[PDB]
Amino acid sequence: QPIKLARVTKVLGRTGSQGQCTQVRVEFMDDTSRSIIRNVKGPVREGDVLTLLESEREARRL
Amino acid sequence: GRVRTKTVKKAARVIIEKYYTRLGNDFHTNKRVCEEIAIIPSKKLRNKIAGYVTHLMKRIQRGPVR
Amino acid sequence: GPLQSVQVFGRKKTATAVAHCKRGNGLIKVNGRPLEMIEPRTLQYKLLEPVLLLGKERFAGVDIRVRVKGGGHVAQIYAIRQSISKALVAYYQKYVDEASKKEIKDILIQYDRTLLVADPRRCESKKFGGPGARARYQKSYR
Amino acid sequence: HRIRITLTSRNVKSLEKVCADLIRGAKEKNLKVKGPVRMPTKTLRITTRKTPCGEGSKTWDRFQMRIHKRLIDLHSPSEIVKQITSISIEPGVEVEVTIA
Amino acid sequence: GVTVKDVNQQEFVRALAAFLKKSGKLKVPEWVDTVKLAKHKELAPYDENWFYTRAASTARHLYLRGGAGVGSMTKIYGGRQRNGVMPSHFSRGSKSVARRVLQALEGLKMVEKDQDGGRKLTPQGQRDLDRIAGQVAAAKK
Amino acid sequence: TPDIKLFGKWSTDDVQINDISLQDYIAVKEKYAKYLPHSAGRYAAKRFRKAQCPIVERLTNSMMMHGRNNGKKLMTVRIVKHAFEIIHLLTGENPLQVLVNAIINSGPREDSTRIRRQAVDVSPLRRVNQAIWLLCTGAREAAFRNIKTIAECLADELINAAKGSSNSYAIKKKDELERVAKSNR
Amino acid sequence: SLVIPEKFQHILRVLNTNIDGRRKIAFAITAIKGVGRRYAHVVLRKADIDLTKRAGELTEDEVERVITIMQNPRQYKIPDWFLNRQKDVKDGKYSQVLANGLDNKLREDLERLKKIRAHRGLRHFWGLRVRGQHTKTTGRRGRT
Amino acid sequence: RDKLNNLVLFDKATYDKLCKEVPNYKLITPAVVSERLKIRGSLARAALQELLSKGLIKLVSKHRAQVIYTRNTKG
RNA sequence: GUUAAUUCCGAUAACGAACGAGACUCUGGCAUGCUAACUAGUUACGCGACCCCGGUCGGCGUAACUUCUUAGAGGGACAAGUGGCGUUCAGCCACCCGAGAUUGAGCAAUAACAGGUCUGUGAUGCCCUUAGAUGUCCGGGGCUGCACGCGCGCUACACUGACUGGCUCAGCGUGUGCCUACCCUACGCCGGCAGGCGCGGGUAACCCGUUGAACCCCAUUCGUGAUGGGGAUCGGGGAUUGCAAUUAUUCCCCAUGAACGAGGAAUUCCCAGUAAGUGCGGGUCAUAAGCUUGCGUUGAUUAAGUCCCUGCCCUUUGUACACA
C-alpha cells in the first residue's frame, strides 16, 4: 500500500475522552480535490505537513 | 483575559458624561486628565478606568453609543 | 583628557555583572582574570560570543573591567555575557556616531535577545505546605 | 563637633517626615550637614501556628515588621543639636544623639 | 611579564609544587603521610606529595586576598560532611594540619603575620609567584 | 566569526532535512543554531515556541532524567560535545546530519489512542517529541549497570538510527508502536 | 612493563584469611577483617611500597615486612588513632590484631557482660539493639 | 547468573592482539576495547598509557570519565 | 455571548442597595532620572611591592559620584496600538515596541459543622479532691520496650557514578538576655579530631564575613565485583553540654561492612526558574534537625486540551428523603 502525505489546514475541536486528540482538516498535495477526515493527537498547528499511511480508515464526525 | 467590572465602568462613564471636552484619544493623553477631575485612590485604578474611557471613544468614533 | 568611563551593569537572579569600559587596548578582564578562565571551561565559546559575532576591531580601542558580586557558576556565565555585550551599547551612544550604534544591535538581536534584555525569572517564595515553590507535601489517606 | 543623630521609626512615611524636617531644620539654620542615610531595613519573620490545638490543616502565619533607620551627621556644636531635636517629637521616631 | 591571573591555575598548582620540589626545606610535619586532611573526608590522598600541593594552594589564596587566619581558611578547604544516613552538611576543615601549612611558610620568608590578625603575604612571597607565572606561559607557547 | 557560525568545530549549514513533514520542527539551520546549546529557557512558555528550539538543545534537555542527573546541565553539554566526536570517528560524516536521519527513522508515523484501543494518525511535532524521548532513554539503558559510558551508548544509538537496523531501543518501539496500532484499529 | 610477570600469585596466604591477588594492594588488604580502607593505605605508606601496582607482583619476602607492620603497629610508628583495641581491659596495650584475634578479643567482653549481668550484655542476649536504637519500627526482616 | 571475569594484566596471547588488532580498530576507547577483550576498563586506560608512549595512537579529546584516542594518519 | 468569576453587555417585574470575587495591602525583576550615604562601593591618583610603557594588589589614604550596595517619593501597563473573531456591544485571539500583554502571597460574603482545643489562659458553668490531696516539692523510671501493621521523612540500589586534590560563586538571616545563672566569634597556639588557653571586634551595612556553602568545572585511582556504591549493626578509644547519659545526650578516630539489581496491585506532587538535584539561616537548643518555615545554587520532560475518573457551582427534572 502506497503512503501519501497530508497538510493540516483547519482544526475543529478536541476529540477523544481527555481531549488528547484533535479533529483535523487535511488536503492531499498529490490531489487537492480529495480530502478525508481523521484525528491527530498532540499539539496541531494549521499549515504543516504530516505523513499518512493509507486513506482506507475513516473517522466518524462527532 | 481582562474584563471591566461594575466599579471600573461606573467611574469611567460618569467622567465621560460630564467631562467630554477635556479627554483626548491616546491613553496617556487623558490619563492625567482623569487625575485632576476625580480622587483616585491608587495608581492601578486610574489606569484601569482610563483604558475603558479610551475604549469607548473608539465606539464613539465608530458612531453613536446607546 | 576625556575620561571614557562607561559603567554598564547587567543583572541575573543574583549575579550583577557590571562591565566598566575605558579607552585603551583590546583586553577584557573580569576581576582581573580574562574571559578565558572561568569554570566551567566547556562553555568557552559562550564567553567569546561578542567576539565571535562583532569582531576584534570593534574592541581594539575598548578595555573592559568587570566587578561581579553574587550568582552561581552558570548564572555568572550569562551575567558576564550580557554585561560586556551591553558595555559597548553605552560606549557607542555617547562618544561616537549612532550610525555604528544602529547596525550593531541588529546583529546582536538576530542571535538571541538575552544579550540585551535581562531574564526576569527569579526564585519565587517557597510556600507553606511544600518543600518548593509549587510542590506540595505527600498527603496520604488513612 | 561631628555630632551624629540617629532616627529609628516603625512607620515608613512618619520617618520620612521627620528626616525631611531635619533636612529643612538644618538648611534653615545654615550649618554643615551630612545627608540622612537611607539605611536598609530588617524584617522579623515570625512564622507560627495559627491554631491553638493540633487539630486542623497545617497553616503557617507570616508576621513581618520592617524597622527602618537613618543617621544624620551635624558639623555643629552641641547647643544647636538640643535646640532642634527637643521640639515636636512624635511617638513613632526615636532620637539618639552621638557626639562622635 | 604576566601575573597569576593569566596562567592556567589547575596546572599552576603543579607548577608551584614544582617550585617546592626543588627546595624541599619547609619543615614538613612527621604525621603528614598518615593523617586525614579534614574531619569530614572519608579517605587519604592518592599522592604522597599532597602537603606540598596543599601548601601551594595556601600561598595563592592569600595572594588574592590576605588577612585570613587558620579559623577562616578552614572554610576553603572544607566540604560535604557525609554522615551517611543523615543528609550531608557543610563542615569546616581541620585546624592543626591547616595551621602547620602557615607555619611551614612562616620560618622561611614566604608569608608574614598580618597586623590586627591574619596572614599577610611578604614581598619575597610575591617575587616567586610572578616569576614562575612566565615559566608556564613559556610552556604554553 | 561574525558572518558564519561554527557549532563546536562542525559547520551549521550543509545539513539536509529530507522529510518535508519535519522541515519546520528542526530549526538548526542559520536561525536558532548556537555555538553551545546552553540557554536559559522561555521556549516552553507558549505552545509551539519549543518547536523553534533546535533539536540538539531539545535532546540534551531530555537527558535531565532520574533525579541524580537532574540539576546538572554541565553533564549533558559536555556529553553531547563528546558524543558528536565519537559519531564522526566511525561514520566520518557531519554528526548533525546523523541526528536528522535518527529522528526520521525512530518516530513511528502511526500510533493508538483511547476513545479497547483505537489507532489514529499522529502529529509531526508529536512524533519528534516522542522520538527524542525514545532515543535518549535508549542510551540510558545501555549505559546503566554496564562497562560502557553514556557518551558511547548515545553515539552507538544515533549511528544505527540513521541506518534503521532494528537494534536500537528507539527503533524497537518504532516497530512495536506501529504494529500494535495496525492490529488495534 | 605491564605484561604478566613471573611467579604471579592468584591468592596470597596471610593469617588464615583469603587475599585476592587480582585486586590492587591498597584495597585487597581491606578484605581482611580488622583492616579497612584507611588502615590498609597507611601501612603501604609506612614502608617503601608503590601502591600503583597490583597484588600479584609484590614478593613473598616483602609481605613478611608488611604483616610485621600490622602485628607491631606501635613499633613501626603507626599512630595510636588507627588501633581497634586502644586501652584494652586485660593487657592495657594499644595494638591492632588482625583477622583472628579481633573476634578473639571481641567475645570475652560479651561474657564479661554476662559475668556482670549488665544491661549492655542483655541486648546481645536478647539479640536487640544496644546503642539505644528503636526496634518498634525497624528490625523487622531479622525477626520472622 | 553472569559474572564479568575480566583480566587484571595482559597474557601473551592477548598482548599481541593489542599490537595487531587495535591498530586495525577504528574506535579506541577504554570501554569498547575492554568489551572486545574481556579486560578491566581501568586496564585499557593503562594500555593507552603505554601506546601513547609508543607514539602510535593520537588523542582527540580527553576527559576523566572517558579518554578518546584515534588512529594514525592514512597517508 | 463573554469572563478566572452573580465579569459585564444585553433582554427583563423588577428597581434601589450591599457583600464575596473584584477592589485593597506586601514582594520580585524596568528606572544610566532626584534625595541621600565616612556603618557600602565606583572612577582617577598619591605612595609601597612584583614581572618585562603596560598588567595586578577587599595593601593604605584622598577629588568627585551613585553605574554596581540600600531605601523614600515615585514613574512604568492600560489592551495601550495594529490585524483577524464576535449583535461588532460586552469582549477574545496573534503581533510591533516595550522589564513586565495572565508573578506570587495576606485579607477573603450569608450560614453551618454536635470536627478539635476545659492539656494555652488569673476565660469559664456544673461535678470531684482538699490533709492519709487530682495542691505543691524532691529522688528514680516510663513517655525511647517489641512477633507485627500503617503514615510523614533521609540514604542509596552506582561509571551522567564513588574517592582524592585544585577551583569557585548566596540572601533570607542570626548574634552578649528584667528574672536569666545563658551570645556570634576573629587571631596565635596544644592536639589528627572533637575540645582547651590568652586576648580582642560586634547590641550589629562597623565584627564574625567581601558569608571563599555544596552538586556541578578540571586532573589521578576505581571497572560491573553487592565492588572503593550503600552505611545499617557492632567493639575499642578522646572531649564537649549537663549536678546527673546507664537505654551508647552530642561530636571525633579505627574497625565491623548486612539488605538493597529501579520496587506488584495501587497511590502522591507539578506544569515556567516550574518539578527536581543541592547547600545555608530561624523555631525546636544547657547539650541538638532525620521535622518544618524561609533563602540560595543548578534546573528540566510534556501540555496550553478534557470531563474519561475523582471533586466544585448553576438550570431543568422525579421523590414515599427532610438528623436530607
mmCIF file of N, CA and C in Angstrom, chain E residues 1-97:
data_model
loop_
_atom_site.group_PDB
_atom_site.id
_atom_site.type_symbol
_atom_site.label_atom_id
_atom_site.label_comp_id
_atom_site.label_asym_id
_atom_site.label_seq_id
_atom_site.Cartn_x
_atom_site.Cartn_y
_atom_site.Cartn_z
ATOM 1 N N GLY E 1 55.747 40.837 31.178
ATOM 2 C CA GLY E 1 55.501 39.864 32.226
ATOM 3 C C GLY E 1 54.031 39.688 32.549
ATOM 4 N N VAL E 2 53.685 38.528 33.102
ATOM 5 C CA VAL E 2 52.309 38.200 33.449
ATOM 6 C C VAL E 2 52.247 37.841 34.930
ATOM 7 N N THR E 3 51.035 37.886 35.473
ATOM 8 C CA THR E 3 50.759 37.557 36.861
ATOM 9 C C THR E 3 50.001 36.234 36.932
ATOM 10 N N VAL E 4 49.571 35.869 38.147
ATOM 11 C CA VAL E 4 48.834 34.623 38.356
ATOM 12 C C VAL E 4 47.443 34.642 37.742
ATOM 13 N N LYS E 5 46.963 35.799 37.286
ATOM 14 C CA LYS E 5 45.644 35.908 36.678
ATOM 15 C C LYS E 5 45.631 35.514 35.207
ATOM 16 N N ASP E 6 46.798 35.288 34.603
ATOM 17 C CA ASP E 6 46.888 34.874 33.209
ATOM 18 C C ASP E 6 47.239 33.402 33.040
ATOM 19 N N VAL E 7 47.810 32.774 34.060
ATOM 20 C CA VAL E 7 48.294 31.402 33.979
ATOM 21 C C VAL E 7 47.166 30.453 34.352
ATOM 22 N N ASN E 8 47.077 29.334 33.630
ATOM 23 C CA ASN E 8 46.120 28.279 33.946
ATOM 24 C C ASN E 8 46.367 27.751 35.356
ATOM 25 N N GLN E 9 45.384 27.913 36.241
ATOM 26 C CA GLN E 9 45.574 27.650 37.660
ATOM 27 C C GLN E 9 45.609 26.162 37.995
ATOM 28 N N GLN E 10 44.938 25.312 37.213
ATOM 29 C CA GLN E 10 44.922 23.883 37.501
ATOM 30 C C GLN E 10 46.262 23.214 37.228
ATOM 31 N N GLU E 11 47.101 23.815 36.387
ATOM 32 C CA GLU E 11 48.486 23.397 36.241
ATOM 33 C C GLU E 11 49.453 24.307 36.981
ATOM 34 N N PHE E 12 48.985 25.453 37.480
ATOM 35 C CA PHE E 12 49.824 26.317 38.302
ATOM 36 C C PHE E 12 50.079 25.722 39.678
ATOM 37 N N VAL E 13 49.139 24.925 40.199
ATOM 38 C CA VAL E 13 49.376 24.251 41.472
ATOM 39 C C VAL E 13 50.476 23.209 41.332
ATOM 40 N N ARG E 14 50.543 22.522 40.188
ATOM 41 C CA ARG E 14 51.667 21.628 39.934
ATOM 42 C C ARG E 14 52.941 22.419 39.668
ATOM 43 N N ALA E 15 52.817 23.569 39.000
ATOM 44 C CA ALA E 15 53.973 24.427 38.765
ATOM 45 C C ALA E 15 54.502 25.028 40.061
ATOM 46 N N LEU E 16 53.610 25.463 40.953
ATOM 47 C CA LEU E 16 54.044 25.943 42.258
ATOM 48 C C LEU E 16 54.574 24.817 43.133
ATOM 49 N N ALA E 17 54.005 23.614 43.023
ATOM 50 C CA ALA E 17 54.561 22.469 43.737
ATOM 51 C C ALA E 17 55.933 22.091 43.198
ATOM 52 N N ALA E 18 56.156 22.247 41.890
ATOM 53 C CA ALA E 18 57.479 22.037 41.317
ATOM 54 C C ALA E 18 58.503 23.036 41.835
ATOM 55 N N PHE E 19 58.078 24.258 42.168
ATOM 56 C CA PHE E 19 58.965 25.184 42.864
ATOM 57 C C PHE E 19 59.283 24.683 44.265
ATOM 58 N N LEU E 20 58.329 24.004 44.901
ATOM 59 C CA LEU E 20 58.545 23.406 46.210
ATOM 60 C C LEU E 20 59.334 22.104 46.145
ATOM 61 N N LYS E 21 59.278 21.385 45.018
ATOM 62 C CA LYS E 21 60.089 20.183 44.849
ATOM 63 C C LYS E 21 61.579 20.495 44.815
ATOM 64 N N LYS E 22 61.961 21.664 44.299
ATOM 65 C CA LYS E 22 63.377 21.972 44.137
ATOM 66 C C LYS E 22 64.037 22.287 45.474
ATOM 67 N N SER E 23 63.354 23.041 46.337
ATOM 68 C CA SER E 23 63.938 23.409 47.628
ATOM 69 C C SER E 23 63.770 22.283 48.647
ATOM 70 N N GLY E 24 62.524 21.955 48.980
ATOM 71 C CA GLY E 24 62.222 20.881 49.914
ATOM 72 C C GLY E 24 62.703 21.084 51.337
ATOM 73 N N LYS E 25 62.579 22.301 51.871
ATOM 74 C CA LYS E 25 63.053 22.614 53.215
ATOM 75 C C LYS E 25 62.018 23.394 54.025
ATOM 76 N N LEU E 26 60.742 23.046 53.870
ATOM 77 C CA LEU E 26 59.649 23.739 54.541
ATOM 78 C C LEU E 26 59.323 23.169 55.916
ATOM 79 N N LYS E 27 60.120 22.218 56.412
ATOM 80 C CA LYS E 27 59.916 21.561 57.706
ATOM 81 C C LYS E 27 58.546 20.871 57.753
ATOM 82 N N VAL E 28 58.438 19.836 56.928
ATOM 83 C CA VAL E 28 57.203 19.048 56.830
ATOM 84 C C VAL E 28 56.946 18.347 58.158
ATOM 85 N N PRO E 29 55.720 18.370 58.678
ATOM 86 C CA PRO E 29 55.408 17.577 59.871
ATOM 87 C C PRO E 29 55.552 16.086 59.600
ATOM 88 N N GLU E 30 55.842 15.346 60.673
ATOM 89 C CA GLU E 30 56.094 13.914 60.537
ATOM 90 C C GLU E 30 54.826 13.152 60.166
ATOM 91 N N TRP E 31 53.686 13.541 60.736
ATOM 92 C CA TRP E 31 52.438 12.802 60.588
ATOM 93 C C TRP E 31 51.678 13.160 59.314
ATOM 94 N N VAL E 32 52.348 13.750 58.322
ATOM 95 C CA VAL E 32 51.657 14.229 57.125
ATOM 96 C C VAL E 32 51.135 13.062 56.292
ATOM 97 N N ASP E 33 51.976 12.054 56.053
ATOM 98 C CA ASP E 33 51.636 10.967 55.141
ATOM 99 C C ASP E 33 50.733 9.919 55.782
ATOM 100 N N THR E 34 50.113 10.239 56.919
ATOM 101 C CA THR E 34 49.217 9.313 57.590
ATOM 102 C C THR E 34 47.978 9.973 58.183
ATOM 103 N N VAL E 35 47.769 11.271 57.973
ATOM 104 C CA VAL E 35 46.686 11.995 58.620
ATOM 105 C C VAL E 35 45.636 12.356 57.574
ATOM 106 N N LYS E 36 44.389 12.472 58.024
ATOM 107 C CA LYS E 36 43.307 12.942 57.173
ATOM 108 C C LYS E 36 43.275 14.466 57.169
ATOM 109 N N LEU E 37 42.976 15.044 56.002
ATOM 110 C CA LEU E 37 43.032 16.494 55.847
ATOM 111 C C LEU E 37 41.935 17.217 56.617
ATOM 112 N N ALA E 38 40.766 16.603 56.782
ATOM 113 C CA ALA E 38 39.646 17.249 57.449
ATOM 114 C C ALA E 38 38.945 16.239 58.346
ATOM 115 N N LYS E 39 37.960 16.726 59.097
ATOM 116 C CA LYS E 39 37.138 15.892 59.958
ATOM 117 C C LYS E 39 35.936 15.323 59.222
ATOM 118 N N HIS E 40 35.815 15.598 57.920
ATOM 119 C CA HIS E 40 34.690 15.109 57.136
ATOM 120 C C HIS E 40 35.092 14.385 55.856
ATOM 121 N N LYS E 41 36.378 14.313 55.527
ATOM 122 C CA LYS E 41 36.843 13.448 54.454
ATOM 123 C C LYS E 41 36.656 11.983 54.845
ATOM 124 N N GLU E 42 36.524 11.115 53.836
ATOM 125 C CA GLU E 42 36.458 9.679 54.102
ATOM 126 C C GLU E 42 37.830 9.023 53.978
ATOM 127 N N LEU E 43 38.618 9.428 52.987
ATOM 128 C CA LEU E 43 39.865 8.743 52.664
ATOM 129 C C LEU E 43 41.029 9.729 52.652
ATOM 130 N N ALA E 44 42.238 9.176 52.449
ATOM 131 C CA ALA E 44 43.594 9.692 52.361
ATOM 132 C C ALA E 44 43.952 10.002 50.910
ATOM 133 N N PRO E 45 44.890 10.918 50.670
ATOM 134 C CA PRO E 45 45.264 11.240 49.288
ATOM 135 C C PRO E 45 45.929 10.071 48.576
ATOM 136 N N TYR E 46 45.698 10.019 47.262
ATOM 137 C CA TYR E 46 46.349 9.024 46.419
ATOM 138 C C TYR E 46 47.820 9.349 46.196
ATOM 139 N N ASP E 47 48.181 10.629 46.244
ATOM 140 C CA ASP E 47 49.547 11.083 46.032
ATOM 141 C C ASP E 47 50.214 11.322 47.379
ATOM 142 N N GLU E 48 51.501 10.991 47.468
ATOM 143 C CA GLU E 48 52.262 11.122 48.702
ATOM 144 C C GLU E 48 52.901 12.496 48.863
ATOM 145 N N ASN E 49 52.647 13.418 47.939
ATOM 146 C CA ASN E 49 53.183 14.772 47.990
ATOM 147 C C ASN E 49 52.058 15.799 48.079
ATOM 148 N N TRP E 50 50.995 15.457 48.810
ATOM 149 C CA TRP E 50 49.832 16.329 48.907
ATOM 150 C C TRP E 50 50.072 17.550 49.787
ATOM 151 N N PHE E 51 50.996 17.467 50.749
ATOM 152 C CA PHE E 51 51.296 18.622 51.592
ATOM 153 C C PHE E 51 51.888 19.766 50.784
ATOM 154 N N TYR E 52 52.802 19.460 49.861
ATOM 155 C CA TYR E 52 53.366 20.497 49.007
ATOM 156 C C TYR E 52 52.354 20.964 47.969
ATOM 157 N N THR E 53 51.361 20.128 47.660
ATOM 158 C CA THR E 53 50.253 20.564 46.817
ATOM 159 C C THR E 53 49.310 21.488 47.581
ATOM 160 N N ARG E 54 48.999 21.151 48.837
ATOM 161 C CA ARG E 54 48.125 21.994 49.646
ATOM 162 C C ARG E 54 48.803 23.295 50.059
ATOM 163 N N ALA E 55 50.111 23.258 50.328
ATOM 164 C CA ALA E 55 50.841 24.478 50.649
ATOM 165 C C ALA E 55 50.934 25.419 49.458
ATOM 166 N N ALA E 56 50.918 24.883 48.235
ATOM 167 C CA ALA E 56 50.861 25.728 47.048
ATOM 168 C C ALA E 56 49.534 26.468 46.952
ATOM 169 N N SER E 57 48.431 25.808 47.313
ATOM 170 C CA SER E 57 47.123 26.448 47.294
ATOM 171 C C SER E 57 46.959 27.487 48.394
ATOM 172 N N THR E 58 47.676 27.337 49.510
ATOM 173 C CA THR E 58 47.580 28.316 50.588
ATOM 174 C C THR E 58 48.243 29.632 50.202
ATOM 175 N N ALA E 59 49.363 29.563 49.477
ATOM 176 C CA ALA E 59 50.103 30.768 49.124
ATOM 177 C C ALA E 59 49.399 31.602 48.061
ATOM 178 N N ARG E 60 48.485 31.012 47.291
ATOM 179 C CA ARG E 60 47.811 31.745 46.228
ATOM 180 C C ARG E 60 46.472 32.336 46.652
ATOM 181 N N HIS E 61 45.799 31.753 47.649
ATOM 182 C CA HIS E 61 44.606 32.390 48.197
ATOM 183 C C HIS E 61 44.945 33.652 48.978
ATOM 184 N N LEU E 62 46.046 33.637 49.734
ATOM 185 C CA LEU E 62 46.493 34.850 50.408
ATOM 186 C C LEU E 62 47.005 35.880 49.411
ATOM 187 N N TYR E 63 47.483 35.425 48.249
ATOM 188 C CA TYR E 63 47.889 36.346 47.193
ATOM 189 C C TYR E 63 46.699 37.141 46.668
ATOM 190 N N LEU E 64 45.561 36.474 46.466
ATOM 191 C CA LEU E 64 44.358 37.166 46.018
ATOM 192 C C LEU E 64 43.778 38.043 47.123
ATOM 193 N N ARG E 65 43.667 37.502 48.335
ATOM 194 C CA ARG E 65 43.142 38.245 49.478
ATOM 195 C C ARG E 65 43.825 37.737 50.740
ATOM 196 N N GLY E 66 44.614 38.597 51.376
ATOM 197 C CA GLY E 66 45.299 38.247 52.601
ATOM 198 C C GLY E 66 44.439 38.489 53.828
ATOM 199 N N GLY E 67 45.083 38.379 54.988
ATOM 200 C CA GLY E 67 44.406 38.625 56.244
ATOM 201 C C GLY E 67 43.492 37.518 56.710
ATOM 202 N N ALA E 68 43.663 36.302 56.200
ATOM 203 C CA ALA E 68 42.850 35.155 56.591
ATOM 204 C C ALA E 68 43.697 34.245 57.473
ATOM 205 N N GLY E 69 43.271 34.066 58.721
ATOM 206 C CA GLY E 69 43.957 33.194 59.651
ATOM 207 C C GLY E 69 43.534 31.748 59.482
ATOM 208 N N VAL E 70 43.882 30.933 60.483
ATOM 209 C CA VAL E 70 43.620 29.496 60.414
ATOM 210 C C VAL E 70 42.124 29.208 60.455
ATOM 211 N N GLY E 71 41.393 29.881 61.346
ATOM 212 C CA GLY E 71 39.979 29.591 61.521
ATOM 213 C C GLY E 71 39.109 29.991 60.349
ATOM 214 N N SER E 72 39.549 30.962 59.550
ATOM 215 C CA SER E 72 38.803 31.369 58.368
ATOM 216 C C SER E 72 39.172 30.565 57.129
ATOM 217 N N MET E 73 40.400 30.048 57.057
ATOM 218 C CA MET E 73 40.841 29.267 55.910
ATOM 219 C C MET E 73 40.477 27.791 56.023
ATOM 220 N N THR E 74 39.846 27.373 57.123
ATOM 221 C CA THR E 74 39.260 26.037 57.167
ATOM 222 C C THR E 74 38.041 25.936 56.258
ATOM 223 N N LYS E 75 37.457 27.078 55.886
ATOM 224 C CA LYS E 75 36.259 27.075 55.052
ATOM 225 C C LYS E 75 36.580 26.722 53.603
ATOM 226 N N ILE E 76 37.683 27.252 53.065
ATOM 227 C CA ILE E 76 38.037 26.967 51.676
ATOM 228 C C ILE E 76 38.442 25.504 51.509
ATOM 229 N N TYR E 77 39.106 24.919 52.510
ATOM 230 C CA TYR E 77 39.469 23.506 52.475
ATOM 231 C C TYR E 77 38.438 22.618 53.160
ATOM 232 N N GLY E 78 37.176 23.038 53.186
ATOM 233 C CA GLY E 78 36.114 22.225 53.744
ATOM 234 C C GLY E 78 35.261 21.592 52.664
ATOM 235 N N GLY E 79 34.079 21.108 53.032
ATOM 236 C CA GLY E 79 33.206 20.475 52.064
ATOM 237 C C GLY E 79 32.040 19.733 52.680
ATOM 238 N N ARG E 80 31.631 18.639 52.044
ATOM 239 C CA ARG E 80 30.454 17.886 52.457
ATOM 240 C C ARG E 80 30.811 16.955 53.610
ATOM 241 N N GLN E 81 30.080 17.075 54.717
ATOM 242 C CA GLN E 81 30.199 16.133 55.828
ATOM 243 C C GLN E 81 29.156 15.047 55.615
ATOM 244 N N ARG E 82 29.501 14.058 54.793
ATOM 245 C CA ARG E 82 28.577 12.967 54.523
ATOM 246 C C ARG E 82 28.515 12.033 55.723
ATOM 247 N N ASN E 83 27.578 12.298 56.637
ATOM 248 C CA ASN E 83 27.387 11.434 57.796
ATOM 249 C C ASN E 83 26.826 10.073 57.413
ATOM 250 N N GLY E 84 26.370 9.913 56.175
ATOM 251 C CA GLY E 84 25.813 8.655 55.730
ATOM 252 C C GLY E 84 24.301 8.677 55.663
ATOM 253 N N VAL E 85 23.653 8.062 56.656
ATOM 254 C CA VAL E 85 22.193 8.032 56.711
ATOM 255 C C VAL E 85 21.602 9.419 56.917
ATOM 256 N N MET E 86 22.375 10.350 57.464
ATOM 257 C CA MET E 86 21.971 11.736 57.593
ATOM 258 C C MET E 86 22.120 12.449 56.253
ATOM 259 N N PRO E 87 21.340 13.500 56.016
ATOM 260 C CA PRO E 87 21.644 14.392 54.893
ATOM 261 C C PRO E 87 22.979 15.087 55.111
ATOM 262 N N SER E 88 23.680 15.329 54.008
ATOM 263 C CA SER E 88 25.013 15.899 54.097
ATOM 264 C C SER E 88 24.945 17.397 54.391
ATOM 265 N N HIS E 89 25.919 17.867 55.164
ATOM 266 C CA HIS E 89 26.056 19.273 55.516
ATOM 267 C C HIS E 89 27.468 19.747 55.199
ATOM 268 N N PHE E 90 27.684 21.050 55.364
ATOM 269 C CA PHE E 90 28.993 21.651 55.144
ATOM 270 C C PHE E 90 29.785 21.651 56.445
ATOM 271 N N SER E 91 31.030 21.186 56.375
ATOM 272 C CA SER E 91 31.906 21.097 57.534
ATOM 273 C C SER E 91 33.212 21.825 57.254
ATOM 274 N N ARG E 92 33.713 22.528 58.266
ATOM 275 C CA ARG E 92 34.991 23.209 58.150
ATOM 276 C C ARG E 92 36.138 22.202 58.182
ATOM 277 N N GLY E 93 37.306 22.652 57.727
ATOM 278 C CA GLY E 93 38.490 21.823 57.737
ATOM 279 C C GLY E 93 39.105 21.715 59.119
ATOM 280 N N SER E 94 40.107 20.847 59.220
ATOM 281 C CA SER E 94 40.797 20.648 60.483
ATOM 282 C C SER E 94 41.725 21.822 60.779
ATOM 283 N N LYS E 95 42.053 21.979 62.062
ATOM 284 C CA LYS E 95 42.856 23.117 62.500
ATOM 285 C C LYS E 95 44.348 22.862 62.309
ATOM 286 N N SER E 96 44.871 21.801 62.936
ATOM 287 C CA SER E 96 46.319 21.613 63.036
ATOM 288 C C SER E 96 46.983 21.404 61.682
ATOM 289 N N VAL E 97 46.423 20.538 60.833
ATOM 290 C CA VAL E 97 47.020 20.299 59.524
ATOM 291 C C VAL E 97 46.943 21.539 58.644
#
